[PDB]
Amino acid sequence: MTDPIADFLTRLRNANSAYHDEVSLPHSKLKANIAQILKNEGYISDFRTEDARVGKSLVIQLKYGPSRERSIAGLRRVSKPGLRVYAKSTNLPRVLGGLGVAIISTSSGLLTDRQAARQGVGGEVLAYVW
Amino acid sequence: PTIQQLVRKGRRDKISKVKTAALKGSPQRRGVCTRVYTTTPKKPNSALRKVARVKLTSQVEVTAYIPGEGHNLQEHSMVLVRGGRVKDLPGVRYKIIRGSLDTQGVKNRKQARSRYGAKKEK
Amino acid sequence: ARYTGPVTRKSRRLRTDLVGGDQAFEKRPYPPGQHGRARIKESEYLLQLQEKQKARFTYGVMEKQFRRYYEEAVRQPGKTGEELLKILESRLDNVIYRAGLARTRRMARQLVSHGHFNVNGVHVNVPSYRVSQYDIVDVRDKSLNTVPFQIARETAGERPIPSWLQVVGERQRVLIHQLPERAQIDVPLTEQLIVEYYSK
Amino acid sequence: NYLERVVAINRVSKVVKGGRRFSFTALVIVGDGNGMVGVGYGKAKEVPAAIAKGVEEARKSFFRVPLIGGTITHPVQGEAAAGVVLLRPASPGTGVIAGGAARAVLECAGVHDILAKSLGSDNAINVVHATVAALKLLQRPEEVAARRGLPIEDVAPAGM
Amino acid sequence: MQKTIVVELEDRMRHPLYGKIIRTTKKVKAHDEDSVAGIGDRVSLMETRPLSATKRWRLVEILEKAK
RNA sequence: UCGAAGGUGGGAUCGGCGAUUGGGACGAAGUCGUAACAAGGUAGCCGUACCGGAAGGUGCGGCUGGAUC
RNA sequence: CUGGGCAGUAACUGACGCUGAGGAGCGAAAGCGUGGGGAGCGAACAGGAUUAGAUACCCUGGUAGUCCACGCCGUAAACG
RNA sequence: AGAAGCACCGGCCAACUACGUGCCAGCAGCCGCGGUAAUACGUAGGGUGCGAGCGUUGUCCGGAAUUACUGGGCGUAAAGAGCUCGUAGGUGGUUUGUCGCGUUGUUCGUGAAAUCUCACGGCUUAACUGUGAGCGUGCGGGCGAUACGGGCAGACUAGAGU
RNA sequence: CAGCUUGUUGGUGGGGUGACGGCCUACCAAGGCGACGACGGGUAGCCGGCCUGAGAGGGUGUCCGGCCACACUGGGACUGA
Ligand SMILES: [Mg+2]
Ligand SMILES: [Mg+2]
Ligand SMILES: [Mg+2]
Ligand SMILES: [Mg+2]
Ligand SMILES: [Mg+2]
Ligand SMILES: [Mg+2]
Ligand SMILES: [Mg+2]
Ligand SMILES: [Mg+2]
Ligand SMILES: [Mg+2]
Ligand SMILES: [Mg+2]
């Protein structure tokens, strides 16, 4: 078992494709921060933290339209544990030509491309969501 | 496969084959043109092709094709050889240049007249 | 070099008349050759080819030079077709044609070639000279009162003068307010096919 | 008043006791030239009949394409049976840089500014299907912002 | 090695093409006028003039001596 | 003392030729069979061993990429 | 005499994990060495039959082998 | 008034007919064309492209996502070792503190000139030439940040083992 | 191409140099390099650049500019900043 962030992305993607309304998954600070970013960008509905048998459990409810369509189109881990990926403020990645979101881990916390270019800081490219 | 596997063992391009072997870097090559003869092509063509055995100045013996209709070649005679395939003769990969040291141009030729060698008219 | 050949054949192949004037039409259909009446296959390459042919033979430019004009246009910021048109239009002999000093394009080219003009008091005789913004074009003061130039002295009313250059009184002089915009100035062609031709 | 392009015509055959019975297929692209395009396959024993059937199939199977001013909104990658097509938007200067089938589809749809590259199989039918798949995958800023919220969290420099 | 110590240095640097971070080790030879240093013994070094054919480093201080 | 060139010696290594001999490929409309493709007329392939002008045969084990009620 | 697995408990340790270039071990049958054993089967071999021929298929015999002890060999459509 | 040629015209790929020849002579980059009505051979007429050039040969990149980092694969198309254990190596669960090696921000030095890009300036234009700004992906020094990776010091039981 | 190395690896005293240094010498110790490819074989002047390419890459090092090496083949010193 390696790369829990990729595990988190895979769980969310599979549930979103299976048309599920919520997911459960072991809670870590990094996952909580990524969930906060996703909610702020509007790709999910609200999330919450429970207390499982051992440790804590993180539950995310997924957002769908009036018809049954997904608000999340894709998801892909970028900086894998076998090859870390970093970027500078000059050349932060662009997702769907700007219609998506790329998560950047900076010394000031997790940020999106817009929030990171407006601050002029780079860092590790965690994942694309769009 | 596996960036670590690539780091340990990089990509290696394919192996090509030299085609200019007798010319060995030169665009043309002089030869002595021994033992001129004729050859029948591969199965579905049934023609009579005019060829020659050329001993090149690169100290290699190759077989060349004589283009055009009608030629003045013979036994020992200096020719200028270039590259080119015939696709029906089995292993001929060289052509005699017409309009060079001993191979005079094609007589009565009127179209394209530069291949095969021919001055316009005077 | 120059073409120096029948212009009507070259218009009949491209199905468009490029000359106008006294020899505007040949008064006959467009079979450009012996087999010119054939209803032939229409490829995608053919449209691009013939559009670039129209662009070249509207101005009498040669393929090698048009090629360079293409890199200039694509390398210029903005768009591509309008920049190509602007470059092809700023040619001094074209300016002479558009300023109502010429019956055709060929004879405007010959007048520029034989050095009948000065720009900033500089004797120029290259047809491919490129005029610029705030350029004045002056006829050689020792070259006036000559028949083919004074025949255009009184006939300055029929063909319209575009809105980037300007002509003045009896001293026939040209002033360039700004570089043209050929896309809004007399396009007998679509510039979007030259670009596609120069991508294959 | 439509734009119709026949892309590929090939002669297929079926063997019987007597011999080979020949027929014709004619893949046709039909679109209004503005924002909407359709694809129809069509097949018959004679070329004009196959072309006709392709035309009605395409006209019935019209679908809508999201444009942002003469080009597509964002890059996409379409996947047919085995054909792969990549589309990217370009500045207004560019033309339509595409192969045969993709160029037919895009120019009928009414796209002026596109870089299209086919990476998978070279079959015309599958290239067309991959291109329409990518055009399906395309998105518009307005519903991506409807899906997410506060429709300014994008970049819309030109607009008009 | 009679007043000489051998120290292993490790450094990590991005792969030129694939972008992975590769770890590599060196082996420099350092000088001990007063030879007291054993196996393990993370040490600090400072490079100096050619004190020998192969020695270019001098021991500074033995920090966190071996366990 | 060191010392180029030279001399002596035993090896290493890279090529060329070589009577004769092993296979390979391509040739026409040659000779001998008919091994495979259908249950291809004894199901076929795989490993191994022996044998036989030649395709191959047979034994042992395996597989279905074969059948049977 | 001896190896592994699963479930339950949650008693214990506290990341001790995963994979693994080379390497090592095991590894059907046939085959090989030394010794023993040998009913049946059965390569090779012999005869009969079929056939134009039949170095085969079918029949009658039949040696190695198949078995055991101790070593070697290290290959299989060793396949899901 | 002293001054135009070369290549091609079956598809790719713009450009077609007649005559002669009759698996012959020959052509051909591919696959093919020629065995008596050849747009594929030779000539003519016509056409197309380019033009003081036009064709052929040779070599390199491209197309080729056919060595795949960007950017490919392994049931049957080429491709999972017969299976396991294990060395170097690669990779690593949750959580606290610290360091600031990786990472990232900024500044100083350097990254010669020419060449290259963008803007002018000068040769009648252009090629060419001068100027200014970029570029020079980097490296070294100083000063910030600590989200993630890593090191160091702990903790936990969910993985692993007993 | 899987084992290479004995001034070889290190130390001390001397010598030598414009200068540190096995650069050299006497003595002492027994090390040093290697699968992250030592030792060996093949090929090659290196770079700013040039060609190609969407880019990443690939090929190349000719004019021009910088550095290196050599001057019939091999060795040696002298004069001198
Ligand atoms: Mg393919
Ligand atoms: Mg010393
Ligand atoms: Mg011999
Ligand atoms: Mg058989
Ligand atoms: Mg048979
Ligand atoms: Mg039989
Ligand atoms: Mg059989
Ligand atoms: Mg037998
Ligand atoms: Mg067998
Ligand atoms: Mg069996």
Ligand SMILES: [Mg+2]
């Ligand atoms: Mg405890």
Ligand SMILES: [Mg+2]
């Ligand atoms: Mg293991």
Ligand SMILES: [Mg+2]
């Ligand atoms: Mg192994």
Ligand SMILES: [Mg+2]
């Ligand atoms: Mg064994």
Ligand SMILES: [Mg+2]
């Ligand atoms: Mg056995």
Ligand SMILES: [Mg+2]
């Ligand atoms: Mg035995």
Ligand SMILES: [Mg+2]
């Ligand atoms: Mg035996």
Ligand SMILES: [Mg+2]
């Ligand atoms: Mg025995």
Ligand SMILES: [Mg+2]
């Ligand atoms: Mg028996």
Ligand SMILES: [Mg+2]
């Ligand atoms: Mg028997």
Ligand SMILES: [Mg+2]
């Ligand atoms: Mg018998």
Ligand SMILES: [Mg+2]
């Ligand atoms: Mg095997």
Ligand SMILES: [Mg+2]
């Ligand atoms: Mg088995």
Ligand SMILES: [Mg+2]
């Ligand atoms: Mg054509």
Ligand SMILES: [Mg+2]
């Ligand atoms: Mg005829």
Ligand SMILES: [Mg+2]
């Ligand atoms: Mg002909």
